[PDB]
Amino acid sequence: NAMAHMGKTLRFEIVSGVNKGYFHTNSQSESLDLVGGIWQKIAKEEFEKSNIYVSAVIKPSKTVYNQEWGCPENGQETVVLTGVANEEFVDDIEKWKDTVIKLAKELKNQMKQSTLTCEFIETELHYFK
Amino acid sequence: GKTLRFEIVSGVNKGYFHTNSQSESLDLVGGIWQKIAKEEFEKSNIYVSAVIKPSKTVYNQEWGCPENGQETVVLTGVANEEFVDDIEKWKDTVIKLAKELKNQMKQSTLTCEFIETELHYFK
Amino acid sequence: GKTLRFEIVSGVNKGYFHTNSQSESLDLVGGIWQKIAKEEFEKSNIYVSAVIKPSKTVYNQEWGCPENGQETVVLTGVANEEFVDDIEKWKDTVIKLAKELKNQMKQSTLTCEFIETELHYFK
Ligand SMILES: CSC[C@H]1O[C@@H](n2cnc3c(N)ncnc32)[C@H](O)[C@@H]1OP(=O)(O)OC[C@H]1O[C@@H](n2cnc3c(N)ncnc32)[C@H](O)[C@@H]1O
Ligand SMILES: CSC[C@H]1O[C@@H](n2cnc3c(N)ncnc32)[C@H](O)[C@@H]1OP(=O)(O)OC[C@H]1O[C@@H](n2cnc3c(N)ncnc32)[C@H](O)[C@@H]1O
Ligand SMILES: CSC[C@H]1O[C@@H](n2cnc3c(N)ncnc32)[C@H](O)[C@@H]1OP(=O)(O)OC[C@H]1O[C@@H](n2cnc3c(N)ncnc32)[C@H](O)[C@@H]1O
């Protein structure tokens, strides 16, 4: 037996530095667990208030910019977080978007970052059960 | 002209495959995708290539998520007009592959997204 | 308040550079991007930063793909209105850098995609 839902929706992408100066991780595996733990805590706290849980897929990365602006040679250690508003769990896309933005700001604070990006992209989600 | 890209997220089912690292689980999914993409190409003459990335997916521990996230793989690809003449048939093929990956990886659930994109291909 | 993001996928040419791990190949591509982006900024006043991710790309072994996939790097970035005034010129700059990366990495083929996105920038 099987079920499939298709619909138009939004995905998000967030990019954050990982302040090695403060957290002292030794590998991309370790920094992935660091950010995963922080996200898990803040997402749970928000869900308990609003009944909106924002799950995130987290990927290891480095971000390259001008060394004159503080970038290490070959790039700064970063993590990329992405997720989609699944109609199985989301009834109001505007409130979901507001929740993502709030979580992005909290992550910026917890990771002690000067700057952070949060993007929304239109997507067609097929969800299989 | 516009085309489509796809993105799939899958678990790696340590209970069934018993991988010991993110490197090993990346190669596992790579090999499975290679087999199922070839099998579909033999039927339809459409080959769907995939870029695969290591990841962890974070959700509520009450729903079965490990502490700090579940080991996952992200697969993405694009409909390249060099190889694709019919976008509808390509889309149908991706959906078939997404279902087959869900089956082969023994996953309860699976996401497959389509996004509009403008592809520049340099050869 | 829409802008564009880009995605590039490149091989890492073990035949030429002889890297021994995904960590080493990530630093290789990062260093090359850093140099070419700086050079272009000095000419055009457009700096294209990139997020770089480790990956493998899976295609038919009959076409040269290793078993379980080819080692690749994925580069993404977004046109931030804080720094960019003209989206057409930014896109032209990305395309030039994508071609230069193809040349420096000695790749036969390369993809560069553009996707519409809504950027929130927090400072
Ligand atoms: C790697 S798959 C594992 C879980 O990983 C998350 N996940 C999977 N793919 C994605 C994706 N592309 N982007 C973001 N998160 C994703 C999802 O939370 C997914 O949960 P399932 O869809 O499998 O739901 C299983 C059950 O868990 C509950 N649940 C899961 N997510 C939510 C949620 N967001 N809100 C409420 N309930 C939720 C609900 O009972 C549901 O039937
Ligand atoms: C990392 S580059 C390596 C290969 O990796 C795959 N690839 C590269 N970039 C991407 C990307 N963004 N998303 C998904 N797959 C990608 C492609 O399959 C690519 O093949 P090439 O474009 O280099 O074609 C090489 C030759 O191989 C054949 N070929 C490659 N792909 C297909 C195809 N899909 N259908 C038919 N023939 C195909 C054909 O002879 C072609 O001239
Ligand atoms: C991991 S955050 C680190 C740096 O990483 C880059 N970065 C962050 N998120 C992303 C992303 N999603 N995609 C691509 N690059 C990104 C950005 O270059 C960022 O720079 P900041 O926004 O923090 O600016 C810091 C300062 O650096 C200068 N600056 C940074 N980027 C540019 C730029 N593109 N052009 C000119 N000046 C730039 C400017 O003075 C600014 O006040």
Numbering used by the authors:
A (entry chain D): -4 to 124
B (entry chain A), C (entry chain E): 2 to 124
Text taken from the publication that reported this structure:
Crystals of the E71Q variant, targeting a key predicted active site residue, were soaked with SAM-AMP prior to vitrification and data collected to 1.65 Å resolution. The adenine base of AMP is stabilized by π-stacking interactions with the side chains of W64 and F84. The crystal structure of MTA-AMP bound in SAM-AMP lyase confirms the predicted 3′–5′ phosphodiester bond between the SAM and AMP moieties formed by Cas10. MTA-AMP is buried in a ‘slot-like’, predominantly electronegative, cleft between the subunits of SAM-AMP lyase, with the predicted position of the carboxyl group in the substrate SAM-AMP orientated towards the B-loop. There is an extended binding site for the AMP moiety, which affords SAM-AMP lyase specificity for SAM-AMP over SAM, which is not a substrate.
Although most signal via cyclic oligoadenylate, an alternative class of signalling molecule SAM-AMP, formed by conjugating ATP and S-adenosylmethionine, was described recently. SAM-AMP lyase exhibits a typical trimeric PII-like protein architecture characterized by a triangular core formed by the four-stranded antiparallel β-sheet of each subunit.
